[model samples]
Target: GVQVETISPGDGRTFPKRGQTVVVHYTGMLEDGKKFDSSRDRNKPFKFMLGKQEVIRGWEEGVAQMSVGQRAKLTISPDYAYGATGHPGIIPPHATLVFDVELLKLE
Candidate 1:
């Protein structure tokens, strides 16, 4: 299961749907606060289509519930993240992930 905490709840309109493109800024980290990735660090946003498998399951589930301009913190269990296999050299096996995400656009 994933725990979602809204930091800024956006305008409450324009939620993303499957097959729609979404632009977001996010920081991915481990439970101990070790950062793995960040769109903010790169000075760019990440773009993907909802339910497209372009990102991890947690992202698909978490981002789908967000409205444009919403900011949230998602604590994702391993099953919704990288799972037992994880990402090579980045995430350890069975590691849980935490993300701070801001929905920037939906198209």
Candidate 2:
């Protein structure tokens, strides 16, 4: 199961729809809090189209629930993330993923 906690729910009424672009800042980590990736470290937000399969299933599902300027934490099951074959050098196989995500824009 995936758990979502809204850190700062957006005031904006516009939520991202499938095929629309969304910009976000995120930090991805393992359950033990080991950092894997962070867009904030690069000083830029990551952008991808919602429901386009451009990112992990967790992201596609999680971000779909957000509105512009929203900030949230997502605890994703392996099934929605890397699954049994995780990303080499970054994630372990069958690992769960934790992400602190902030929606910046919808385009």
Candidate 3:
């Protein structure tokens, strides 16, 4: 299970579902306070197809529950992310990830 905490309640009324495309701003970090990725730092929101295997599992699940313009903190365990074998050069093994996610749009 994921730990979801709302940072801000967005004004949008509709929530996204699987197969829809979503745009988001996010910062991802490890438990040790090391930042691994961020859409804001990239100066662009990231977009992906919902329920697609294009991104990590936790991301898919977490973003699917978001409404347009919503912001939340998602704590994803290794079971939902890279498990014992993490991504090379990025995430470490058995890593737990924290993401501050803002759903910008649905397309």
Candidate 4:
């Protein structure tokens, strides 16, 4: 198939349509590129079923706009990320997020 190179679909057009599962390798950071997490350095990938609530809303939306071997940098608002409660250790209560991600697969 001919791979299409397109601007990120801001509305999440490529996001998992229903129960599709996606695999990715990611590096997350603040806008200044202070890395918070990475899968490439660990030689592993992350997987989640679409709409499964396994990850934050920004991740679900960002990773959907990719194809196999596609990479992107996503900047997400705090409201789309961890919100007011935040994850205990990694994310603060009102943090916005930025991610460098490679989409490995969609199934």
Listed per candidate, the RMSD to the true structure in angstroms reads 0.9, 1.0, 1.1, 6.2
Weakest lDDT window of 10 consecutive positions for candidate 2: 9-18
lDDT of 1 by residue, 19-81 (tens): 999999999999999999999999988999887898888888888888889999999999999
Candidate 4 residue-wise lDDT, 86-107, digit = tens: 6788887777778877777777
Q: Taking the candidates one at a time, how many backbone clashes does each contain?
A: 0, 0, 0, 0
Off by over 4 Å in 3: none
Judging by lDDT, tell me the better candidate of 1 and 2: 1
Best by lDDT: 1
Quick one: how many clashes does candidate 2 have?
0
**In candidate 1, where is summed lDDT lowest over 10 consecutive residues?**
50-59
TM-scores of the models, in the order given: 0.95, 0.94, 0.94, 0.77
lDDT of 2 by residue, 1-107 (tens): 57888999796698889899899999999999999899999998899988779888888888888888899999999999889998888899999999999999888
Candidate 4: stretches off by over 4 Å:
1-15
Per-residue alpha-carbon lDDT of candidate 3 for residues 1-107, written as tens digits (9 for 90 to 100): 47778899876578878898889999999988899999899898898998788988888887777777789999999979999999999999999999999999888
Clashes of 3: 0
lDDT of each: 0.91, 0.89, 0.87, 0.71
Models sorted by TM-score, best on top:
1, 2, 3, 4
- In model 2, the Cα lDDT at residue 44 comes to 84
lDDT at residue 58 of model 4 (Cα atoms): 78
Error at 65, model 1, angstroms: 0.8
